[PDB]
A paper describes a structure:
The length of this linker varies significantly between different species, so we designed a version lacking its least conserved section spanning residues 86–130 (Δ86–130 Parkin; Fig1A). This version of Parkin was crystallized and its structure was determined at a resolution of 2.54 Å (Fig1B). The higher resolution Δ86–130 Parkin structure superimposes well on the full-length Parkin structure (backbone rmsd of 1.6 Å), showing that the reduced length of the linker does not perturb the conformation of Parkin (FigEV1D). Intramolecular interactions between RING0 and RING2 block Cys431 in the catalytic site, and the E2-binding site is occluded by the Ubl domain and linker between the IBR and RING2 domains (Fig1B). The Ubl domain mainly interacts with helix 261–274 of the RING1 domain (Fig1E). Arg6 and His68 form hydrogen bonds with Asp274, a residue located at the end of the helix and preceding Arg275, a frequent mutation site in familial PD (R275W). Like ubiquitin, Ubl has a hydrophobic patch centered on Ile44, which stacks against Leu266 of RING1 helix 261–274 (Fig1E). Asn8, a residue conserved in Parkin orthologs, binds RING1 helix 309–316 via a hydrogen bond with Gln311 and Arg314 (Fig1F). The first and best-ordered site is on RING1 opposite the Ubl-binding surface and formed by Arg305 and Tyr312 (Fig1C). Ser65 of the Ubl domain, which is phosphorylated by PINK1 (Shiba-Fukushima et al, 2012; Kazlauskaite et al, 2014a), faces the disordered residues 382–391 preceding the REP helix and is located within only 12 Å from RING1 (Fig1B).
Author numbering: 1 to 73, 140 to 330, 332 to 337, 345 to 347, 351 to 353, 359 to 373, 377 to 379, 391 to 410, ...
The structure:
């Protein structure tokens, strides 16, 4: 059998595999050509990952069928997750901060803090009074920081607003495993995916060249379920793939623009008929060296793997930590205050403790 193997590239090289050939042996043969540990390689066919024990007959692979390989080398409750450009260079939980937008000083006092993503992403959406002297600024300018290490106020990361604390134990749409955090799509059902599958998914589309181009916005991916009007608008979410794969994604304009012009290279490093450049000659029909002879997701997972909602019971209401009078939460803001005048405890919904900067940063609000 011939199967075309696409590995960090648009073109797929052919591999010879017998009827009983194991997915591990395929991942052994691809490891020789590419020189990488087999225990990090992941074979994906039609969107489904193939486990090592499986065989060609079980998979329902056929002649010239395309398989991708992708390489993969009380606790703090975190609402916010960011991409830290350094030193981490990977997605991390972040701290949510605010400042006076008029003077750029982190002293902006909020009557009531933020309740959701729109409150902290839409500029000039919130308001307060700044504690700078001779500063009139009322504008709340929210920013984020990586939480994996200390950071100067100035050193800010971008929030990945789709990445969500899986506090509802929602299973993945791709793998059915309950992970944390998870990416939640902006389709009608708010479909949930784990970040391991988001990676697998983004990479598979890069090799396939199945990215979508929002003309004004750029190139993106919709929900994995194919849902309409679910393109990821916040394109910094592709930073999650890491630099190799992000870098690849950025080069998609170049490569599509060349595709539209009628251009075509099949090297792993990089008028009607030689790479010059890299220096490697090849056929244009089959992409071989110079010499031309010789996608769905399951419905049951899709129903379960939605952000959806929880019907209120018992989450809905909690007694005041100090005085015990029931308080029900309004919106997603964790910052509770007590109307009982002999008490008036400001506390955190989630932690059950007095309100403070840690709760604020880790989870001023929750989704
Ligand atoms: Zn960091
Ligand atoms: Zn100010
Ligand atoms: Zn998954
Ligand atoms: Zn969806
Ligand atoms: Zn080349
Ligand atoms: Zn050829
Ligand atoms: Zn109270
Ligand atoms: Zn808290």
């Amino acid at each position: 059998m011939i199967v075309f193997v696409r590995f960090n590239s648009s073109y797929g090289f052919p591999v010879e595999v017998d009827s009983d050939t194991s997915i591990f042996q395929l991942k052994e043969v691809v490891a020789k050509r590419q020189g990488v540990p087999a225990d990090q390689l992941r074979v994906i066919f039609a969107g489904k990952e193939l486990q090592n024990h499986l065989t060609v007959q079980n998979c329902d692979l056929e002649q010239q069928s395309i398989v991708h390989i992708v390489q993969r080398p009380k606790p703090t409750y975190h609402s916010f997750f960011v991409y830290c450009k350094g030193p981490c260079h990977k997605v991390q939980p972040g701290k949510l901060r605010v400042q006076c937008g008029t003077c750029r000083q982190a002293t902006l006092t909020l009557a009531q803090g933020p309740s959701c993503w729109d409150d902290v992403l839409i500029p000039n959406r919130m308001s307060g009074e700044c504690q700078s002297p001779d500063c009139p600024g009322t504008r709340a300018e929210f920013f984020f920081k990586c939480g994996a290490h200390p950071t100067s106020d100035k050193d800010t990361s971008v929030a990945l607003n789709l990445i969500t604390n899986n506090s509802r134990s929602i299973p993945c749409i791709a793998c059915t495993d309950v992970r944390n955090p998870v990416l939640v799509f902006q389709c009608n059902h708010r479909h949930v995916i784990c970040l391991d599958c988001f990676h697998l998914y983004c990479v598979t589309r890069l090799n396939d060249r199945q990215f979508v181009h929002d003309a004004q916005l750029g190139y993106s991916l919709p929900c994995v379920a194919g849902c309409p009007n679910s393109l990821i608008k916040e394109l910094h979410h592709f930073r999650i793939l890491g630099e190799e794969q992000y870098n690849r994604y950025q080069q998609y304009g170049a490569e599509e623009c060349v595709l539209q012009m009628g251009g075509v290279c099949p090297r792993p490093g990089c008028q009607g008929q030689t790479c010059e450049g890299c220096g490697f000659v090849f056929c244009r029909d089959c992409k071989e060296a110079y010499h031309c002879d010789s996608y769905r997701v399951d419905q049951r997972a899709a129903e379960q793997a939605r952000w959806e909602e929880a019907s209120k019971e018992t989450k809905t209401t909690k007694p005041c930590p100090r005085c015990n009078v029931p308080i029900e939460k309004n919106g997603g803001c964790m910052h509770m205050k007590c109307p009982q005048p002999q008490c008036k405890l400001e506390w955190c919904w989630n932690c059950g403790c007095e309100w403070n900067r840690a709760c604020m940063g880790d989870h001023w609000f929750d989704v």
